[PDB]
Amino acid sequence: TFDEVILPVYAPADFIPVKGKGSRVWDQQGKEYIDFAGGIAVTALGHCHPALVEALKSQGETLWHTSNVFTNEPALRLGRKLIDATFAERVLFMNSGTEANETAFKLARHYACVRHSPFKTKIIAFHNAFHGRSLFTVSVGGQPKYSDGFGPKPADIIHVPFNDLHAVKAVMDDHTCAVVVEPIQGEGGVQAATPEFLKGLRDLCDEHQALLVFDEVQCGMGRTGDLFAYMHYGVTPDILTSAKALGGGFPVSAMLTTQEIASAFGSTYGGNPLACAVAGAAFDIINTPEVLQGIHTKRQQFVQHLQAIDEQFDIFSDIRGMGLLIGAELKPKYKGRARDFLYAGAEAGVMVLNAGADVMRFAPSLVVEEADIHEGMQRFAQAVGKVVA
Amino acid sequence: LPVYAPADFIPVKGKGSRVWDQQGKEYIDFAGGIAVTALGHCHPALVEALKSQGETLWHTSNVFTNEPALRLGRKLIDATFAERVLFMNSGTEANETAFKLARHYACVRHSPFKTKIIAFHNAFHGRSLFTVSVGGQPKYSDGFGPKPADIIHVPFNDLHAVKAVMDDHTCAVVVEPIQGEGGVQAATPEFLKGLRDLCDEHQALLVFDEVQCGMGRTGDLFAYMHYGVTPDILTSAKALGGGFPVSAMLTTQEIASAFHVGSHGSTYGGNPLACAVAGAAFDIINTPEVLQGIHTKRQQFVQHLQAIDEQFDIFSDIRGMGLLIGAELKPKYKGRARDFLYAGAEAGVMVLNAGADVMRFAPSLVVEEADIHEGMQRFAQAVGKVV
Ligand SMILES: *Cc1c(COP(=O)(O)O)cnc(C)c1O
Ligand SMILES: *Cc1c(COP(=O)(O)O)cnc(C)c1O
CATH class of the missing domain: 3.90.1150.10 (Aspartate Aminotransferase, domain 1)
Structure with a gap:
């Protein structure tokens, strides 16, 4: 049936x-x-999971959807929980990891444009990186086989080897807006960043006035044994993305950042009521000792x-x-x-x-x-x- | 603002x-x-579908199919020009998939240089970098660094402008049969049929963005049915899940085959819970x-x-x-x-x-x-x- 129905x-x-x-x-x-x-x-x-089923059923009989014009109680509550538990001061909710990454990359770009220079456009990313399959996110992704063949790609993206701090130092300048990295490259053979590499990324972003962007779509929400992988490393990013585990199965995602960075674009924007209710119950369980x-x-x-x-x-x-x-x-x-x-x-x-x-x-x-x-x-x-055998 | x-x-x-x-x-x-x-x-039917599937299975990945997705795919295929469907989460993602497909089809079937996308002023297609660049509001696409290139904007309902910019290097024409955000402007019969004829002439794919005007909105299941003009690719969302984040990209087998294993596209997309809800919504909307x-x-x-x-x-x-x-x-x-x-x-x-x-x-x-x-x-x- 699969071959007859879906691409x-x-x-x-x-x-x-x-x-x-x-x-x-x-x-x-x-x-x-x-x-x-x-x-x-x-x-x-x-x-x-009975707690997630409970949340889905209770919100499902109350309110499913508001547009981004309105806020809603589940979104505000989840926003607060993420803000209290992390470096974040502002949260932006979407549906998928790709969309959260789109939001993060666009924000890093726009922050550089308005706060520094319209020419501050370089994004540094890594070989074997996976950030999603939209044209932009797959171009930031470090797998040419996935980004080839879709016409002109969004420009000013530079790829260097994961864990190669010197390569990053070599390519970064005053025209660099961001470094995008998975603290652990899940799809890329489950390779964890070294302490010196991740710390080094923070120092270089500080030096060149670029934003450090952590893709924690896979490695976030308790996956590593900390609420987020950055907490294990003790390296605080400027922007972080979260999805997958966030809704425990419900299509939901979040982009976390500071008020200073968010202002380039209330403590919370968007977020489907049903999605955020489920993600709230999921957060409540995962974020326990x-x-x-x-x-x-x-x-x-x-x-x-x-x-x-x-x-x-x-x-x-x-x-x-x-x-x-x-x-x-x-x-x-x-x-x-x-x-x-x-x-x-x-x-x-x-x-x-x-x-x-x-x-x-x-x-x-x-x-x-x-x-x-x-x-x-x-x-x-x-x-x-x-x-x- | x-x-x-x-x-x-x-x-x-x-x-x-x-x-x-x-x-x-x-x-x-x-x-x-x-x-x-x-x-x-x-809606009691949608609430019941949400609750029942919610007790059974929410999520498998796309290296698996599931019954709700198959059921929904079959219903969309039976009721439309489509022979193949791809499920995603949002209209933006559906449009991303559609635009990438039109690009890749042209790349492999004709030429890697056949890249031009024709879109329209006041068009809205989403807020990802690619979709917002295809969108016809420069204010929303400005200020995010280098935009993906080879997108040409002309006025909506202006057939002569389309004819003028189209050539053998054009891969797609992207259009909302009714521009919802852009002042609720409906395509004229001449304009939309003209787009079909020009795409035929230039071997370009006609992509209908029916995210807003689709799924019963116009009084037909899809707006293209009112016009009697069949697109090569159609995108659907919003009404599709009646509030649940779900979307679909509809095309033919010939076009879909341009994609191979790994060309796209999603973690959540094809979601058992989403598709069960969308199935229940489809069943109600698609009745005389x-x-x-x-x-x-x-x-x-x-x-x-x-x-x-x-x-x-x-x-x-x-x-x-x-x-x-x-x-x-x-x-x-x-x-x-x-x-x-x-x-x-x-x-x-x-x-x-x-x-x-x-x-x-x-x-x-x-x-x-x-x-x-x-x-x-x-x-x-x-x-x-x-x-
Ligand atoms: C899975 C994944 C994504 C993609 O998220 P979707 O929900 O599939 O859009 C992006 N980045 C990383 C690191 C991932 O693991
Ligand atoms: C609403 C809309 C979109 C966006 O879909 P999302 O679900 O918001 O990603 C795209 N195109 C049109 C015509 C729309 O109306």
């Missing part, structure tokens, strides 16, 4: 998920799967399994990432074959991810039960075993 | 075409959150009875607007299609649209603008006759206060 932009699994509860999912044939993928780090509280502590407990449970799998099958050269964003890089013998293990995983009843062709990625619910971790990782071990 | 609500106008509850704020003041909703809540607030009702209701609004002009002498033109209504103000009241809107709010009726000279109405497609009369009596009161 040839995706190559989906043979099975169709129909129901989810917690970190378990069922297809049309009733086959049960363990979810270590979370729809690519989106369902951070699992499927149909115990949930954040548990993310680190759960990571080591996952990592110990991956270490045991490697001890058995000689398969991983590296296990990396932060919190419940986990990357397992394949050894040279299994290079380029990440998709093979993902497919065998699904056959064994476990849903995993890739991060390029050389890396297995895990992004489960932040509250995934210990029992589900052990069962799912046993399934993945069997899947690995089938590929090896 | 921009219309913003004060601290004492915060909507907290909606029921049908009525809205209440924090202080419990009741409003009649003729705005629909800018033509979004096409079935009113908290609701679509007939839209024309009945339009005339009820128009008769009130005519009566207001008879008493107050404020309108020079009443236009639009279905329940997308534009009422242009007379020269003596140029630039007063915002003031009539705020006076409306004071009188307990929510209306829109379409530029500083035009009043816009985009109510629920099933707005009750009683709400129409009451709300327009409130608006007639608001007008009297202004004049």
Whole structure:
């Protein structure tokens, strides 16, 4: 049915998920799967979490939609929660990570234009970066194969290697408006920024009067075991973007910044009432000491399994990432074959991810039960075993 | 300039075409959150779809399909020229997908140099850098650094201008069959058919932005059906989810095949919860009875607007299609649209603008006759206060 209905932009699994509860999912044939993928780090509280269902139902019988002309109570409440918990003084709500990034990039550009010079236009970004698939965001993204072939790209974007501080210093000048970076490049093989690199970015932005833009669409909202990855590093950005985990499955996103920067464009703008209600309930759960502590407990449970799998099958050269964003890089013998293990995983009843062709990625619910971790990782071990044999 | 609500106008509850704020003041909703809540607030069918799917499955990623998405895709394909659909979150994203597709199709089918996009003055297509550059308001596209190039703007309804700028290096013509933001201006039959013929001649794709005028708004499922002019690509949002963030890009198999695995496009797009709600909305809007009702209701609004002009002498033109209504103000009241809107709010009726000279109405497609009369009596009161 897929090939007959929707554009040839995706190559989906043979099975169709129909129901989810917690970190378990069922297809049309009733086959049960363990979810270590979370729809690519989106369902951070699992499927149909009672508190998120409650919020959806309660707001759903009250008010769904206002235009950006009006504010609404769920948006104001969520805005306040994000402002109180972060560096942010102002928040702008959208629907997707791409839109949040569009907003952040446009703001950095416009801030430079009005506060400094219309010629202050250079955006520094990184190879293997992913920021979305709109023309602008994909051009800021560091994957030419995704940005090629759509006509003239928005100009004045410069790409250098991730974690290469000297390259950044080399390209930055008084005509630079922003540095855009994922504190951890999720799609780009789960590579975390070094402390010196991220700190260095802050110093260079300060020097050249450019804005440091953190894309935390994937690595934000508790993913790393801190509310946002920047908190782990102790490096404060000028602008931050958040989505995916923000709504635990509901299409929602946020752009966070200071009042000084926001004024280039109330403490909150926009935000769908239904979306913000759900994101509010999601925030309330994730931003607790115990949930954040548990993310680190759960990571080591996952990592110990991956270490045991490697001890058995000689398969991983590296296990990396932060919190419940986990990357397992394949050894040279299994290079380029990440998709093979993902497919065998699904056959064994476990849903995993890739991060390029050389890396297995895990992004489960932040509250995934210990029992589900052990069962799912046993399934993945069997899947690995089938590929090896 | 921009219309913003004060601290004492915060909507907290909606029921049908009525809205209440924090202080419990009741409003009649003729705005629909800018033509979004096409079935009113908290419609029982849409609430039921939201709640039931909400207990089952909200989100899988696009490396999976889902039943609600398949069901909705099938319904759109069966009812339109479309053979393939791509689901996204917003009209902007749908337009991004459409414009990228037209560009990529030309690149692979003809030439990497076939890049020109023809768009129109006063057009609105969204607020991403690309979509706002295709949009026809330079004030909204200025000041964000280098714009994506090869976009040419000409006046809406000016066929000769289009003919003049089009060539073998043109990949697309992008147009709203009715320009909603741009003063509620409908394309003439000659103009829109002319666009089809020119796109045929130059092997360019005709892209209809029906984000505002689509999904029943005009009294047809899509505005293109009224005109009898079939586009190569169509975009839909707003009314599609009746308040739930959802959008769709509609095209043929031949065009869709230009995209391969990885060409696009989304994390949320194709969302099981979104598509279930949109399915329920589609099922209600795409019925002869609701679509007939839209024309009945339009005339009820128009008769009130005519009566207001008879008493107050404020309108020079009443236009639009279905329940997308534009009422242009007379020269003596140029630039007063915002003031009539705020006076409306004071009188307990929510209306829109379409530029500083035009009043816009985009109510629920099933707005009750009683709400129409009451709300327009409130608006007639608001007008009297202004004049
Ligand atoms: C997934 C992701 C995005 C894209 O967000 P959408 O919701 O797909 O628009 C952008 N940036 C990063 C780092 C991401 O991981
Ligand atoms: C409202 C509108 C859009 C924007 O859609 P979003 O959902 O706001 O991204 C684009 N084009 C037209 C014609 C519109 O009316």
